[PDB]
Design a protein around this ligand. Structure first.
Ligand code: ZN
Ligand code: ZN
Lengths: 107, 248, 209, 47, 186, 51
RNA sequence: ACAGAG
DNA sequence: TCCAGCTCCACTTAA
DNA sequence: TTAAGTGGAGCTGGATGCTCTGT
């Protein structure tokens, strides 16, 4: 990330001193000792998942005493939760039911 | 089955490191600085890919800044840290900003030249089988990946067919592609004409065009070369070499 | 991995067996039908398996001409093969007194070692193959017809039926992949049996130049 | 450099896209107006 | 570099990755409580959005003029320096100023009550400056350092400079052209 | 007239945000090494920031 | 040099 | 307005 | 340490439908 000198407002560079790494200006004496953990997370865009789970994938989210799907009222359906974008998104829930003479897709 | 098709789809399609990493961060420390990449292994398990942290370590150090393999560690089964160095060729050690946007453009699985791909199905009632449309420019790579029937794959570009399969397959590709383009617009040409065109293009062991550069290797007469394009240069060249011409 | 890598060491060796069958060398029947599960016998999977000197071939003798006409097949372990490794294979070939040798590289070759193979000798001919080409037999592809390399006593009949010279036939390059499959040189004449749309066949001829 | 990046924009990807131009300017010793004008004057085609 | 990399079917434990990641960078050399190692809390580096300066720590909605003139009287009695922009001509006459119907600004009027500021229901704020009702709107919110200083040249070449305070908010005044227009149209 | 206000402010030295190894070098670059008759800084260091 | 026509 | 040749310059191997 | 063979990048030079009918 860009960080700028409070004095002259040029761009700081990271360098190493005798006790710490420092943010340092190239044009004025100002330095800032990195005393503690500092971070910057990008969170880039992940792949699409729409055509990846279709067609009898290796799902696993099913559990004992799981709810039946609302239309058929049978537990013959899978359900999953995934991030669709990066993991700062709150996970969305989706489910699909597959029964005899019955095909549907629901949210 | 489609489960077999998506493995070989992901085996050839260009998959970026920035497309499988959930967060890519710099971490500044009082003793060190590096870049930390945590592989979202859930989306690795869903995409059915042969990639983990040791594969990403090997995908790094292929055309990136000359980073050393010692500079990259595999501390977990997700995290991959890249300690940068001084490039020392018009570069400052603050090159972490270069790798912060450049490291998500390395490829960990697939072919570098393939743009995208799509699973294609048929419609006929007798069967349901899955062919594969690869918008790419590397024929030898698609013929070599496990799971793709290399005895039965073709291309549009005649240069790749000449480079991979030979001159005779390039002749057959020219025939089939000219006839396919003529069929798709409601026209019809007997196959002897396109056969004569393809045998005229491939009778010197190389696919020559119908440009002024392919005609300058097929035809020998100075007047035939100079009555079409670049009229003056052939005249001074035939004056220089003392080239006699036939009137045949 | 350890399944995709041994699959390649199966398929490359099988394609080289079919290549040596096509040129005229001695390949028995139990080497062409070598299944992967039967390939797991002479060497196992990767760490006990040996690439560079354990999967070589020097059994290949030309059964037609003479049992001394022999030909190497090597698997260099490093990706880029330098001059020194070519010197190693050269002194090995010198000691065994073989004249022909194939090389199956893994990624490519450094540019001076490719230049070395041109001027080793006119008697020490070597043929560089990449292994990404040998993963599929280009003869068995549906776009490439059957080629048959002709003898001189058939080329003399060909030039007598059409009353030609040699330099009026069509051409095929020395660096063509199907030309490098049969190892043909400047001067030989190939026969291409092109398939028709009917049940018939067409016969064309090319010159290697 | 701060006022230049202010006039360009204060979003994150805008600064990320503009960063390798500040990194080029700091490679040369251009930090002053007279230095920048001396750099430009050595690139002018003379009339 | 060994190329034939090996993989396995087993599923990674969530906490095992979390604690491995934790152990990779939670190490700290902050034990050096020394002068050089110390750092001044009031001279942190400037993260670029000036409202969002704090990147490192010890651990917005847009306001309207009725919400500014409600907090400065009810929430706190403390005085605040506003910087308001008026229109170019104020509805006055230059008093015997040697004229042409030119611009009448604040450099021509005298001291005294010059107007009454009317705050209305539903957020309307008007500056009634005589027979005309003007309109008052917020300006671009400045978030940098503005200082209302004084300069006194009490003598020929020496004098005093005094700082009076800081300026945070801005007001922009404009004539209500619809209301000035609806009296006599054209 | 033509209002052009030039200030000068003094930054301290004993704070840890003042790398003296760079201040000595920049003061040696700006000042004459021992002249000090007319000189932008009084001491051996950069003490001011002019506006 | 421009406009037409097929 | 679009596209093959020609020439300059870094980039590894090898001695 | 450096000689050398080969990649990649910028510059350069070529080309762009057939006729009549008039001012
Ligand atoms: Zn600074
Ligand atoms: Zn159902």
């Amino acid at each position: 990330m860009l960080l700028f000198c409070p004095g002259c407002g040029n761009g700081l560079i990271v360098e190493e001193g005798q006790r710490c790494h420092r943010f340092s200006c190239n044009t004025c004496p100002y330095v800032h000792n990195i005393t503690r953990k500092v971070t910057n997370r990008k969170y880039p865009k992940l792949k699409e998942v729409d055509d990846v789970l279709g067609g009898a994938a290796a799902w696993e989210n099913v559990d004992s005493t799981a709810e039946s799907c609302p239309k058929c009222e049978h537990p013959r359906a899978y359900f999953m939760q995934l991030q669709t974008r990066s993991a700062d998104e709150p996970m969305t829930t989706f489910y699909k039911c597959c029964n005899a003479q019955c095909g549907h897709r629901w949210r | 089955d489609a489960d077999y098709a998506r493995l070989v789809k992901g085996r050839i399609e260009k998959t970026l490191l920035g497309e499988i990493s959930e967060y890519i961060e710099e971490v500044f420390l009082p003793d060190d600085c590096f870049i930390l990449v945590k592989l979202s292994l859930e989306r690795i398990r869903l995409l059915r890919l042969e990639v983990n942290a040791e594969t990403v370590r090997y995908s790094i150090c292929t055309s990136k800044l000359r980073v050393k393999p010692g500079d990259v560690a595999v501390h977990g089964e997700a995290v991959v840290c890249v300690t940068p160095r001084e490039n020392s060729k018009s570069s400052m050690y603050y090159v972490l900003q270069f790798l912060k946007e450049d490291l998500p453009k390395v490829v960990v699985q697939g072919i570098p030249e393939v743009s995208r791909a799509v699973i294609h199905i048929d419609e006929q009632s007798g069967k349901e089988k899955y062919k594969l449309l690869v918008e790419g420019d590397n024929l030898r790579a698609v013929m070599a990946t496990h799971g793709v029937k290399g005895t039965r794959t073709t291309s549009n570009n005649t240069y790749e067919v000449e480079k991979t399969l030979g001159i005779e397959a390039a002749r057959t590709t020219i025939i089939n592609e000219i006839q396919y383009t003529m069929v798709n617009h409601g026209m019809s040409i007997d196959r002897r004409h396109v056969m004569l065109l393809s045998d005229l293009m491939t009778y010197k062991g190389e696919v020559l065009g119908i440009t002024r550069f392919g005609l300058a290797k097929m035809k020998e007469s100075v007047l035939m070369l100079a009555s079409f394009e670049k009229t003056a240069d052939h005249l001074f060249d035939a004056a220089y070499f003392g080239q006699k011409d036939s009137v045949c | 991995d350890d399944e995709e890598e041994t699959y390649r060491l199966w398929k490359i060796r099988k394609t080289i067996m079919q290549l040596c069958h096509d040129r005229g060398y001695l390949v028995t029947q139990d080497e062409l039908d070598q299944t992967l599960e039967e390939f797991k016998a002479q060497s196992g999977d990767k760490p006990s398996e040996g690439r560079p000197r354990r999967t070589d071939l020097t059994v290949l003798v030309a059964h037609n001409d003479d049992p001394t006409d022999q030909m190497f097949v090597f698997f260099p372990e490093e990706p880029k093969v330098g001059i020194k490794t070519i010197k190693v294979y050269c002194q090995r070939m010198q000691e065994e007194n073989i004249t022909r040798a194939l090389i199956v590289v893994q990624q490519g070759m450094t540019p001076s070692a490719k230049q070395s193979l041109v001027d080793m000798a006119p008697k020490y001919i070597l043929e560089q193959f990449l292994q990404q080409e040998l993963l599929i037999n280009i003869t068995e592809h549906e776009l490439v017809p059957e080629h048959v390399v002709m003898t001189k006593e058939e080329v003399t009949e060909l030039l007598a039926r059409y009353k030609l010279r040699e330099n009026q036939l069509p051409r095929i390059q020395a660096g063509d992949p199907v030309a490098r499959y049969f190892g043909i040189k400047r001067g030989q004449v190939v026969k291409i049996i092109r398939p028709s749309e009917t049940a018939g066949r067409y016969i064309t001829y090319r010159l290697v130049q | 450099d701060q006022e230049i990046v202010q006039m360009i924009g204060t979003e994150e990807h805008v600064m990320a896209a503009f960063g390798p131009s500040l990194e080029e300017c700091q490679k040369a010793q251009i930090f002053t107006q007279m230095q920048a004008l001396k750099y430009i004057g050595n690139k002018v085609r003379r009339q | 570099r060994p190329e034939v990399i090996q993989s396995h079917s087993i599923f990674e434990q969530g906490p095992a990755e979390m604690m491995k990641k934790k152990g990779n960078w939670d190490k700290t050399v902050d034990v050096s409580d020394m002068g050089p190692s110390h750092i001044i809390n009031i001279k942190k580096e400037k993260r670029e959005t000036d409202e969002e300066t704090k990147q490192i720590l010890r651990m917005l909605p847009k306001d309207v003029s009725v919400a500014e003139l409600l907090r400065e009287l009810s929430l706190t009695k403390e005085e605040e320096l506003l910087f308001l922009q008026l229109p170019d001509t104020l509805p006055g006459q230059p008093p015997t100023q040697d004229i042409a119907e030119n611009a009448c600004t604040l450099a021509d009027l005298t001291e005294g009550q010059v107007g009454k500021l009317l705050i209305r229901k539903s957020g309307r704020v008007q500056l009634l400056l005589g027979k005309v009702t003007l309109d008052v709107t917020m300006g671009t919110a400045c978030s940098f350092l503005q200082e209302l200083v004084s300069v006194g040249l009490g003598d020929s070449r020496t004098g005093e400079m005094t700082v009076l305070g800081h300026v945070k908010h801005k007001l922009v005044c404009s004539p209500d052209f619809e209301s000035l227009l609806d009296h006599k149209h054209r | 007239k033509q209002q052009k206000v030039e200030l000068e402010m003094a930054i301290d030295t004993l704070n840890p945000n003042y790398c003296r190894s760079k201040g000595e070098q920049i003061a040696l670059n700006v000042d004459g090494a021992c002249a000090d008759e007319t000189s932008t800084y009084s001491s051996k260091l950069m003490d001011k920031q002019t506006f």
